[PDB]
Design an enzyme around this catalytic site. Structure first.
Site, PDB file in Angstrom:
ATOM      1  N   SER C  62      35.159  48.317  34.377  1.00 33.67           N
ATOM      2  CA  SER C  62      34.340  49.357  33.781  1.00 33.67           C
ATOM      3  C   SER C  62      34.571  49.518  32.280  1.00 33.67           C
ATOM      4  CB  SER C  62      34.610  50.689  34.486  1.00 33.67           C
ATOM      5  OG  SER C  62      33.777  51.702  33.968  1.00 33.67           O
ATOM      6  N   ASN C  74      27.194  35.458  33.143  1.00 30.47           N
ATOM      7  CA  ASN C  74      26.650  35.087  34.444  1.00 30.47           C
ATOM      8  C   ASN C  74      26.536  36.320  35.335  1.00 30.47           C
ATOM      9  OD1 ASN C  74      29.376  35.546  34.946  1.00 30.47           O
ATOM     10  ND2 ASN C  74      29.634  33.760  36.283  1.00 30.47           N
ATOM     11  N   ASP C  80      33.458  30.205  45.510  1.00 25.24           N
ATOM     12  CA  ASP C  80      33.380  29.813  46.914  1.00 25.24           C
ATOM     13  C   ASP C  80      34.731  29.367  47.462  1.00 25.24           C
ATOM     14  OD1 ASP C  80      31.735  29.098  49.354  1.00 25.24           O
ATOM     15  OD2 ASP C  80      32.514  27.098  48.858  1.00 25.24           O
ATOM     16  N   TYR C  83      36.343  26.131  46.247  1.00 18.99           N
ATOM     17  CA  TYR C  83      36.916  26.039  44.905  1.00 18.99           C
ATOM     18  C   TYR C  83      38.396  26.403  44.990  1.00 18.99           C
ATOM     19  CZ  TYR C  83      36.829  26.301  39.741  1.00 18.99           C
ATOM     20  OH  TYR C  83      37.026  26.107  38.392  1.00 18.99           O
TER      21      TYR C  83
END
Lengths: 128, 128, 128
Positions: C62, C74, C80, C83
């Protein structure tokens, strides 16, 4: 659990590639040129009828900025199960941080589905 | 599921209605003027006690940038069940890409709840 | 559940990733300077092997914008289960809206895990 999917035209990449669990890549449905500090809704060329009680989440791929210099203005897109009309095509809301050309077929974002939140009751109280 | 909600004052628009899983829209608690390339915490005029074991996620609505020219600086806000005090009001961290103005009562973002992350243990290793 | 974590080097601050449920903070693995309107992939100095069938989501904390004046390009990173390689380190894609300097060990983002989407069947149709 299935998802009916409609494509804008016969040239769109069939994303029929998935059902293993990984987020599914979405691609620009055509060539798009966006000038620096300009906004553009990029057609993804797909329309879907998600499973009942589900919604889809759309975010850019980790390499989207490095590759095209754009950010997704809405951070994370939400497509509800009700967005299943024959004309309910998906779009990627892009803001260009630099002059950029997006080629038809380019992977720019990805999505996955998730169960919608449980039904809630927002009861007003004077003190918390 | 019951969620206790407190409003900043009587002028704030109440948001209790028949829910069924769709994300819920939040609104600017007051007029907010933001200059090009400047920041502003837009108050949403609400404070909630989320269900135990849950958290809320907040993202802009899909039409937020088109209408107001702002993006959420934190991408997706995360509100924990513990943020339930009498003065724990919600805000939408807005960064404007142009001179803009959000009017009191304007729908500016949306939220949903989700069960918090499960119990997990972190085991440090030298190699994977 | 267990998450195996590997650190870049012995000087990295071990995530105090503690507190059942709470998102976990990640830190810059080294000092980084970013000029206004420029990009920089900030290494977080960690690599992990997530539980089978799970994925990780990472977003700014925040107070990241307030503290360092950067946004995550992004929006939300998605790591995933696959990875999990020994050199599969995590990074925070940062775009600075002003001159800023991040210090080694500064908490700049946070993450949580979640079950991946159920396996689905994408059935192409011609009408929705």
């Amino acid at each position: 659990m299935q998802i009916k999917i409609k494509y804008l035209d016969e040239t769109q990449t069939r994303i029929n590639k998935m059902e293993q669990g990984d987020w599914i890549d979405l691609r620009a449905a055509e060539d798009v040129a966006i000038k620096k500090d300009e906004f553009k809704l990029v057609p993804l060329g797909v329309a879907m009828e998600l499973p009942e009680g589900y919604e889809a989440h759309v975010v850019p791929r980790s390499s989207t900025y490095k590759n095209f210099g754009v950010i997704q203005t809405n951070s994370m897109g939400v497509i509800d199960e009700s967005y299943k009309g024959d004309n309910d095509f998906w779009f990627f809301p892009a803001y260009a941080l630099r002059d950029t050309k997006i080629k038809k077929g380019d992977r720019i974002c990805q999505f996955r589905i998730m169960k919608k939140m449980p039904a809630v009751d927002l009861i007003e109280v004077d003190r918390l």
